[PDB]
Amino acid sequence: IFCRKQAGVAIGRLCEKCDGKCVICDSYVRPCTLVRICDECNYGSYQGRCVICGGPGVSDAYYCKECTIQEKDRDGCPKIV
């Protein structure tokens, strides 16, 4: 289940285990569009946590080229909750 609220200026992050992965489709191939998340997902204790699984977040999350081509980057906040 994706949050799907209005994406903000906050940037999505990935933990070490979930890195390279597109948030929407788990592909390791061609990261393309930088992930944006809703404020509530960035708020307080949630600052810098992983979009896929809530881990410490070390890298910037991306939608892959296919998700970008399909405009799946536009659906809203993709933090899995």
């Binding site: 209005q6 994406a7 903000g8 200026v9 906050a10 809703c38 405009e71 980057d73 536009r74």
Partner: protein, 1181 residues
């Protein structure tokens, strides 16, 4: 198979225009949207003239624009709403001459979608927030602020969504430094979707709703909403804080209303109507656009009505409260997409269609001033008299081709270079415009020279002069010295002998060169002379503001340089060349230098050679180049140094200049030895080669455009009181002073006025006359307009009973004689279903009307043809297809007619022959095998001529919907359906049958069609796409149990090309635009854009531009945030087209990006630019 797209002429129409200091400097500029293109304009307040600073293809649909400024800032940002799902903020950068994308906030899916924001865009007047909203449901609010580094920063969006709710318009409300507020005209459709009686739909009130953004609580509250008495079409922000009483002005049918929140009463004023208006009395009146003008003391609005009339609107206040609106009629101008008031006292008027205008505001408004405070009776109205311009003075008109409705590329003028015949405009501002590639030339003076003139030169008397002081003229046996007005012998001590050159020798000095020697002339009465040593003579020469070089018999070169006192000194060294010198050139000196480095020398050797004149390496060779043939001429120039070469043959050359000369390019330029001359243009140095041609730079690119003018034989630059920047030229005896009207424009246009919107025209083959059909809906014929005016005058008298009848008769007589021009005041709007239409025969060379047939009221011409019929052999007939009493929405028609005229007196007169009735609109007429095909609604018919009527000889009933067009080759007929695209029909002679044999597999809303080959059709549609459909090989055209395939024909055409042009295309034509050039598919757009699609000749070329396009798509992404591939794939996936408008963005990029992209291509940037130019120069300038 594989096509490249290029724009020739960019869209000239304007959809949006905004005001600001986009440069940050105090000068005011206009950013305009041309739909597909963003453009920045500077009106010069001195000349009162508009210059394009910058144009950018944005590869998306600009749906809205705003300027905004942060509080305490000095520069305006452009915020763009678009079909991209992202709000984009741009800053213009004057230094780089580009828009720089400051922010790109994404919120939704691309396309012009109903519930995704982009249509409406509103800013807090103090810059602190922007709202972007859709037509339905979604509104988003972005907070704007600056960081510690003074860069603009943007928040996460705050939503303000409302289900089932339409938005007509949104504006920001000026509330000073209180919480930002946006006003929306909203309507809730929920009840209207739930009531089967329709009661709710009619009882639904539009509401004015005020959304407050709470900056402290970071949310948007729908603070106030109130219903409106009638629906507003748009809102105007009224100035607030200390500049006004804030609130908003709702423009509605027949009214303008002022509303504000709090204890403010509603103030309402009716829109004044024109006295004795010939329009349909049932029509209500809206304001169509507005502008706001603010000043320290006061403000006012200009609002334009549908009729073009501008009202100055002002608000009267007591304390904070508005007490009345006051309207004063201001002036009448063409109907505007946007109006903008410049602080410098000019009104820019972006016309809805046709040319745009800059007016100086001469006065700010005896004319009666109307008011909400005036008592007015139920159903009554204020009245005003329209008249000629009184507050506005026209200073500039921006020639625009929007809308292009029908174009035809042909050489009708015998100029060996076809002209584009375009039917433009709408209503009484319609025209036929002839477009010719080249610059527009104006004669500033004309004269004739005796005997055999052979050369001409121009000179100052001092370097400080604002103008030249001498023209020197040459003949085969003599020379002559003239003033810049007349022979002048004041300081002109010129020889009578034949001359090589005359020039400015130094700051106060002149020189003449002749085969014997050199004469030095001062401004003061003193003459010095030099002669050629030995038996030798001078043959060629080169000069600069402080230097002379000469070439003698046998190829000996001699050099002279000016010492500080002001005298030439001969250099000690003399050098001989390997061959005879044919020409020479020397670079102009930089203003902070005493001497110029580079001499170029051209030889019988078919080589050009570079030499230094600097004392460090004087007369030493630097570099040399071999050439295709002997030079005729040379010229070194800066914009950056270039050598230009003319050959005795018609092939020009450009090379970059340095101690080693770099890359080069060449072009046909013609047959006569190519002669090169210096010229001054827009203050810059440029060169004239001789068709004649200017070589110059604009938008960081280079252009070699001909002059649309006579054959010229020798020339020079000019500056004078009569002609401040121009040319002295000679053609045979002719001695002309010539000036160039425009820099950037690729076509010059002559405009021939028309009465109604031209639907189509055809060229009579034996005379080149154009038969034009013009047609408007909502329109009176002249006959009906006369009758309506007569009865209005009669009724005006009959309204009076007392001695007032004497005054009424005077007023009626005046009214019958008043004749306000339709092109200025608008044609009177007849009701729905009313048509006016004419058939016009005009000569294309100068647009005189040879004949004019006016059709009956409510007859609308929709098709025209010119043809012979085999039964009569030689005579030409014009067939015009007419609808009777056509109602557009909902569609209904009282049948139609085909009028037949014979065209007589060598193509000059329409003799009416007969009128043939038909059951539905004859929407297409096509000459076919000595008869004519006619598309009568869904029916395709063959008609023969007969005597009393056209005679139906064959018919097909199986076309899906209305036939929109017909084309033919041989026995094949291509039918455009209005929606079901292309159907291939074969006529069979012996059987006398029309058989459908193929169709498309997609709906296309076809607008126009061009046959490429016997099996291939190019189509345009209503949705801005081009396609090419081809019959697959071994398609057979020789053709309740039959069902066909997918409910259509048994055989299917295959789409071999798809491309979203971005603009609706109403014409396509396979043609060669330049003599000896390759053939292309020319297309015109509704926005006045002209472009080409051109086939690649080979894999290598195709592959190269494909790789260029792929790299530019990622490394130089479209400005307003739309994916380029997605945009070109708007309605169908892009197929077999490379966007050359994207490829040519390469030249606009920063050099590091050019280096990155060219490295990816295994090229260097000059090679990339060369390949871009080489394609765009083979098919069409």
């Amino acid at each position: 198979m594989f096509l490249y797209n290029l724009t020739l002429q960019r869209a000239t129409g304007i959809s949006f225009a905004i005001h600001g200091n986009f440069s940050g400097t105090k000068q005011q500029e206009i950013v305009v949207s041309r739909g597909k293109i963003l453009e920045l304009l500077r009106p010069d307040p001195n000349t009162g003239k508009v210059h394009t600073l910058l144009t950018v293809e944005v590869f998306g649909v600009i749906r809205s624009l705003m300027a905004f400024r942060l509080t305490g800032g000095t520069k305006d940002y452009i915020v763009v709403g678009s079909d991209s799902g992202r709000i984009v903020i741009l800053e213009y950068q004057p230094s780089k001459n580009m828009f720089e994308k400051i922010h790109q906030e994404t919120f939704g899916k691309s396309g012009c979608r109903r519930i995704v924001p982009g249509q409406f865009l509103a800013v807090d007047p103090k810059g602190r927030a922007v709202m972007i909203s859709a037509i339905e449901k979604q509104k988003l609010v972005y907070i704007l602020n600056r960081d510690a580094a003074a860069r603009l920063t943007i928040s996460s969006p705050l939503e303000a969504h409302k289900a089932n709710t339409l938005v007509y318009h949104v504006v920001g409300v000026d509330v000073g430094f209180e919480n930002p507020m946006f006003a929306c005209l909203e309507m809730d459709y929920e009840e209207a979707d739930n009531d089967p009686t329709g009661e709710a739909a009619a009882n639904t009130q539009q509401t004015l709703t005020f959304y407050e953004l709470d900056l402290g609580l970071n949310h948007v509250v729908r603070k106030y909403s109130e219903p409106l008495e009638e629906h507003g079409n748009f809102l105007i922000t009224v100035p607030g804080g200390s500049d006004g009483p804030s609130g908003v002005l709702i423009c509605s049918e027949n009214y303008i209303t002022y509303k504000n929140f709090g204890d403010q009463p509603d103030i309402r004023c009716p829109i004044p109507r024109r006295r004795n208006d010939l329009d349909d009395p049932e029509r209500g009146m809206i304001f169509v656009c507005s502008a706001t003008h603010k000043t320290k003391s006061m403000f006012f609005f200009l609002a334009q009505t549908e009729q073009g009339d501008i009202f100055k609107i002002t608000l009267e206040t007591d304390e904070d409260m508005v007490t009345e609106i006051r309207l004063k009629y201001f002036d009448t101008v063409p109907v505007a997409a946007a109006m903008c008031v410049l602080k410098t006292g000019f009104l820019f008027v972006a016309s809805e269609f046709g040319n745009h205008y800059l007016y100086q505001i001469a006065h700010l408004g005896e004319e009666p001033e109307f008011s909400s405070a005036m008592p007015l009776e139920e159903g009554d109205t204020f009245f005003f008299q329209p008249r000629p311009l009184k507050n506005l003075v026209l200073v500039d008109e921006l020639d625009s081709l929007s809308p292009i409705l029908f174009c035809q590329i042909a050489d009708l003028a015998n100029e060996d270079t076809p002209q584009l015949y375009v039917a433009c405009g709408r209503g009484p501002r319609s025209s036929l415009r002839v477009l010719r590639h080249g610059l527009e030339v104006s004669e500033m003076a004309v004269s004739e020279l005796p005997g055999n003139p052979n050369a001409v030169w121009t000179v100052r008397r001092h370097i400080e002069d604002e103008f030249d002081a001498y023209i020197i003229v040459s003949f085969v046996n003599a020379t002559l010295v003239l003033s810049i007005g007349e022979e002048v012998t004041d300081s002109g001590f010129l020889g009578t002998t034949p001359t090589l050159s005359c020039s400015l020798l130094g700051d106060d000095a002149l020189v003449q060169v002749y085969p014997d020697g050199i004469r030095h002339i001062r401004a003061d009465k003193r003459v010095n002379e030099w002669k050629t040593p030995g038996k030798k003579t001078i043959v060629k020469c080169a000069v600069n503001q402080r230097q002379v070089v000469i070439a003698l018999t046998g190829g000996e070169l001699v050099y002279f340089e000016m010492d500080p006192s002001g005298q030439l000194n001969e250099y000690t060294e003399r050098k001989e060349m390997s061959a005879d010198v044919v020409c020479m050139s020397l670079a102009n000196v930089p203003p902070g230098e005493q001497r110029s480095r580079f001499l170029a020398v051209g030889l019988v050797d078919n080589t050009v050679r570079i030499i230094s004149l600097d004392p460090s390496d004087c007369l030493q060779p630097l570099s040399m180049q071999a050439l295709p043939a002997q030079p005729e001429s040379l010229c070194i120039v800066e914009m950056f140094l270039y050598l230009n070469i003319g050959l005795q043959n018609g092939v020009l050359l450009r090379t970059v200049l340095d101690p080693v000369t770099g890359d080069l390019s060449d072009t046909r330029t013609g047959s006569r030895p190519v002669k090169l001359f210096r010229v001054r243009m827009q203050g810059q140095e440029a060169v004239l080669a001789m068709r004649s041609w200017l070589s110059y730079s604009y938008q960081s690119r280079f252009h070699l455009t001909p002059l649309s003018y006579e054959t010229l034989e020798f020339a020079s630059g000019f500056a004078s009181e009569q002609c401040p920047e121009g040319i002295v030229a000679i053609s045979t005896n002719t001695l002309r002073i010539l000036a160039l009207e425009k820099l950037g424009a690729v076509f010059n246009q002559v405009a021939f006025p028309l009465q109604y919107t031209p639907r189509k025209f055809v060229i009579h083959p034996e005379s080149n006359n154009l038969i034009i059909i013009e047609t408007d809906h909502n329109a009176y014929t002249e006959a009906t307009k006369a009758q309506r005016k007569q009865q209005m005058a009669e009724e005006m008298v009959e309204a009076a009973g007392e001695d007032e009848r004497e005054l009424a008769a005077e007023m009626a007589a005046a009214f019958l004689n008043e004749n306000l021009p339709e092109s200025i005041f608008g044609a009177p709007k007849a009701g729905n279903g009313q048509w006016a239409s004419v058939i016009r025969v005009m000569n294309p060379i100068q647009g005189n009307t040879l004949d004019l047939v006016q059709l009956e009221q409510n007859e609308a011409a929709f098709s025209v043809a010119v043809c012979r019929f085999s039964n009569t052999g030689e005579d030409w007939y014009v067939l015009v297809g007419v609808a009777k009493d056509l109602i557009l929405n909902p569609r209904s028609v009282a049948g139609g007619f085909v009028y037949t005229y014979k065209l007589v007196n060598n193509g000059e007169k329409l003799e009416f022959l007969h009128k043939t009735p038909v059951e539905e609109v004859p929407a297409a007429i096509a000459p076919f095998q000595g008869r004519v095909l006619i598309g009568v609604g869904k029916l395709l018919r063959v008609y023969d001529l007969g005597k009393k009527k056209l005679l139906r000889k064959c018919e097909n009933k199986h076309i899906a919907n209305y036939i929109s067009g017909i084309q033919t080759i041989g026995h094949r007929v291509i039918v455009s359906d209005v929606q079901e695209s292309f159907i291939w029909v074969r006529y069979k002679r012996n059987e006398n049958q029309l058989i459908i044999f193929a169709d498309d597999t997609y709906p296309r809303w076809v607008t126009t069609a061009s046959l490429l080959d016997y099996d291939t059709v190019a189509g345009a549609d209503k949705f801005g796409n081009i396609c090419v459909v081809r019959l697959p090989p071994n398609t057979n055209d020789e053709v309740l149990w039959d069902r066909g395939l997918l409910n259509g024909a048994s055989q299917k055409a295959e789409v071999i090309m798809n491309y979203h042009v971005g603009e609706t295309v109403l014409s396509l034509q396979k043609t060669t635009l330049i003599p000896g050039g390759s053939e292309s598919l020319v297309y015109t757009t509704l926005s006045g854009g002209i472009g080409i699609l051109v086939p690649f000749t080979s894999h290598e070329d195709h592959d190269f531009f494909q790789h260029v396009e792929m790299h530019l798509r990622s490394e130089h992404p479209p400005l307003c945030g739309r994916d380029h591939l997605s945009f070109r794939s708007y309605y169908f996936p892009v197929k077999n087209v490379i966007d050359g408008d994207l490829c040519e963005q390469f030249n606009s990029m920063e050099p590091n990006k050019q280096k990155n992209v060219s490295e990816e291509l295994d090229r260097t940037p000059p090679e990339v630019s060369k390949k871009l130019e080489d394609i765009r120069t083979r098919y069409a300038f």
